[model samples]
Target: ALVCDNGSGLVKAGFAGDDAPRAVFPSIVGRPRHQDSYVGDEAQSKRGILTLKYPIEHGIITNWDDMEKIWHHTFYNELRVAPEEHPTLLTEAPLNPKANREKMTQIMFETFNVPAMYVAIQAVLSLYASGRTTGIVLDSGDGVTHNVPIYEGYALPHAIMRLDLAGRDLTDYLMKILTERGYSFVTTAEREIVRDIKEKLCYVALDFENEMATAASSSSLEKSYELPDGQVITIGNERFRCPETLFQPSFIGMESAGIHETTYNSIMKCDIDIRKDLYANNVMSGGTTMYPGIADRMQKEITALAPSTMKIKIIAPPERKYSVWIGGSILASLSTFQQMWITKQEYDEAGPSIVHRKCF
Candidate 1:
């Protein structure tokens, strides 16, 4: 997967040489009335102990609950990956918290029987995919924001940055705006409807100081959408106008620090050589990038922030939605990627000690 942010919950897993149907899903587990737990679309039995959690926050998994063993079944049982097949290449946040890392290692060792492999997601994979050792891979996921700078397929510790702001924050802010306008917002069964509108229709305004004129203006072709509860409200045609918050937070109030600043601040932390390569190889991923006119916005904003002589390129995967998962697939498919894997032999040879080793 390029970068998917399945809001609320989902624990997606897939097999090799498969099609798009299972490429991604709500990494959710369904425990409906004593039936066996299932994964992916099949997990939908319409309400039970249906626990849903996205291990990823702002892009990487954090605050994971190991007691919920369904994820193990989803990945190992659903995918049917054997311990000897290949060491599983898992994904995690950049610079994961020590406690979180310990828990993940424990899960692989005790729960899933994963033998050996390096786990990484986003930054390095993006850097490798873009054929760059130095550059930022800005990954936006379900509710997280990550900025990683790679040096030779390995992340530069000093250059990695993260932000708590993401689509969720934007959603809450939008809900607030709707509330202030004397309209009903919390009533929307799936709060994501508003976020959907934002991604499909939002954009950065060149004049950040003038959003009332840019986004707040009414559309000539305004129309109303009917909700499930028979509530009707007027909607506007503001394509490339509303989702300006991810890039320009000032559009929604508070201070005007944008994700672009997150990326830029991250890059500046690296050395000159790394920054030079990054300016040439910046790769943007995440669900938010799917927002209308985003690549153009990144191109325009980052270009303006960098040196005129610096060549900037923002390459997105063909199917941006599945970029990150595809990175895992690519990792699983490589021959030399074999060394990165832990065999059942190494499951005993190294045990879980290798989890502390950095996998590039």
Candidate 2:
């Protein structure tokens, strides 16, 4: 079986039962003025002259044509597999439209001619990656952050919470600060550099106020990063301040509550009987969650808001960045899961609408 986790920023694809994805690349397609289109790393390399197009936005597939190009690249160029030979398992965000699922099913059966396919909720797969069926998955990726409550392999749609702040926002915030300090990083290529700086140097502060105080008084808190052009820029408070927005969205001029509050609110929205389990089994997934001290900060903040008797446990696995794909990998490899895929014959009989009946 082939498992693909189609994240807004990255696509993780590999055969089922693999310990890790064989191909991980950006979910971007680039069109050059005089040459053929490029995808993933090739797109990044040609960003200077290429018109970059993102296939997915905010965890949803916005351009089917570009998206198909990405999947095509994944199969032929990356994985080197024929679509007809393997069953496919794809992941979708919580509350994804019914039409999108139907459309995806149509593409797999009619376009790619895959033997069978299944679409699973990303949050549920994330929870499953951590060896749990019930938990709150706090997935903060590039375009958005989702706090979804999963109970016994299903997501509570009404209880799910989404935060507009994510890795891209933090990168933009850092860029803004650096721009104010005499650095100019405006173009897509330059922004990618800033993003790299953010990921490599940034960390969450244990105490925002104290860290700010130290940053003000001592150069010890500061660190220098060398640019591609041999220019060294100093980064101090900005390191922690960038990720601080995840815990304090107000830092970035957003009115939404922080990730902890969002997680608390999502838990409260669920039935009271399962709230404790959700609290105890909280799972952290996505690239943004890899920031140092984030789990500790989340634990401290949520503990203050949760009931005094309720236990708060935030699980941050080593492979949190690929949790959704890893979960899909685990699930699609199971012998029992073989019977769960929607076969081509079933699609031909019931049409694209069969996804709703089989997948959910």
Candidate 3:
């Protein structure tokens, strides 16, 4: 069996029952002047120029051609596996269109000739990955940030809280700040390099005001970041400022609740009896949430908002970036999972429309 978590920013693919994904790549396909398209991380580096686009947009796949090419490369070139031999599991974003789900099923059965497939909700997969059934899942990815309340393997869709700001927004804001300071990046490759700097250096400041004061006055907070071209830029407060967008979206002129507040807000919408369990088992996933000190900062803010009788525990795995994919891996390996897959025989009998009945 195979599991693939087609995250907007990256694609994680590996065999089911594996400890971790064997193939990880950016969700990009680059069209160049002189060659066939470059897929995955290969898209990141170009000798002269490349026109790059994403297979997914806002967590939903918009280009099936690029999407098919990516899957073809992932299955054969990257993983060196035959699709016809494996039962596959893929994740879909919350609130995805019914038509979109059916299209995915059609492509898998017809294009790749997979034996069976299942489309799992990313939020529910995150809960399974964390080894929890009931909790508030805070997933902050490049596409969007979603706070989903899970109760015994089910997501409460009505109570879901979404934020438009995500890792991409943060990177854009970081680029804006740097450009203001006279740094320039004309290519997507250059911007990608800047994103690497943000991921490597940025962290959530526990006390934003106090840290701001220290950052303004303290040279100790300053560190020099050497770019790919070897020019050094002194980064001081911008490091903390980038990740701070997760906690306070208004800093970037966006209006949205912070991740911590949204997590609690989702819990409030649930039944009163489950609030304690939800708070006690707050599971964190997504690549953006992997920033240093983010979980600790979220825990601190959540505790301040909680009642004295209630306790808050944040379960943010060190492997938070791969948590959703890891969840898919775990779920696909289950003995009971065999009964859950939508086989090709069913697709042949009922057509693309059959996916909704089986997977959901």
Candidate 4:
């Protein structure tokens, strides 16, 4: 099966042995006045095009032009797929806005010539990938963080908590910090530069308070690194610190609560005393989970927040950065993967009812 994160700026695709797609493409599309539009890498390299746009915004395909291009290339080109042979499993956020899902389904059936598809919920795919049907999944992706609780392969909406905080916000915040420090670049360039540092150097602090003290001391290196453009130099200077925001988001003035607080907030009412097994299966996956000390920090934070008897084992994926792709790829590699396929005939016969099945 083909699994993809058709995110705003990149499409990550593949299956096991075929897992973890390095074949990334720009999410932008450039529309020329009198010529055909372009998608992926072709669209990104072109300049002087005011018609460029992204297919997704905050994890949802909100613009049709972007969606159309996404359909043609990423969808039709079948980056890591032979849709005629293997089925497709597309990942989308839980509680995906209804209109977006409808359009997504339409694209699979009409535009891609795909015979089968399943709207794989991110939360569910994570659970299936982890083999955990219970406990909390703190997924921090591009737009936001979702605290999802699962039971029997199902997400508990009542326990679905959220904090608008996420990796993207950190990159944006890092951008501003660099800007004030004399890097007078535009927001786009600033974010791109900051994102580079975050992915390469950002580390989590087990004892955040102590780390902050150390980082502020003269011993702090505040390192510098070169950009992809080769000419631009980004000074680390504390811009890549993950724990800084984890403890005091108020410093950025965007604090309602941090990830630790948000995790605690979600389980405030879970029956920890009775759900021993469920608590042990605590799962952590997504881009933000790659923070240097996140798994340890999560164990510490959740332990402090939950009842003493509650055992909190934060199971960070083996490849924290590529867990979704690996899991989706694992599912795609299954012999019974054929069962997950909701085919064109199935779609026509049962319509959305086919989607209601537990293809996971």
Q: Per-residue lDDT for 217 in model 1? A: 64
Query: What lDDT would each prediction earn against the true structure?
Result: 0.59, 0.92, 0.87, 0.67
- Stretches of model 4 off by over 4 angstroms after superposition: 15-17, 31-36, 46-52, 78-86, 187-190, 227-237, 240-243, 246-248, 269-274, 335-337, 357-360
After best superposition, candidate 2 residue 231: deviation in angstroms? 1.1
The list of candidate 1 runs beyond 4 A from truth reads 1-10, 16-23, 28-56, 59-70, 76-86, 130-134, 187-190, 209-211, 214-232, 237-242, 250-256, 358-360
Clashes of 2: 0
Candidate of highest TM-score: 2
Model 4 alpha-carbon miss at residue 18, Å: 3.2
lDDT (tens digit, per residue) of candidate 4 on 1-360: 567766645677664457476556667777777737777777666535536787676667778866766755764574645455555778777667666666676667666657778776675667667766676777777666677777766676666776666677777776677667677557454556678787777777677557667767754746667776676554544543543675457857884887767767766545554256556777876776777777887788778877897778888886645566666766667776667678888877765545655343
Arranged by lDDT, best first: 2, 3, 4, 1
TM-score of structure candidate 2: 0.97
Q: Residue 226 in candidate 4 has what lDDT?
A: 75
lDDT digits (tens) for residues 208-251 of candidate 2: 99999999999988999999989899999988999999989998
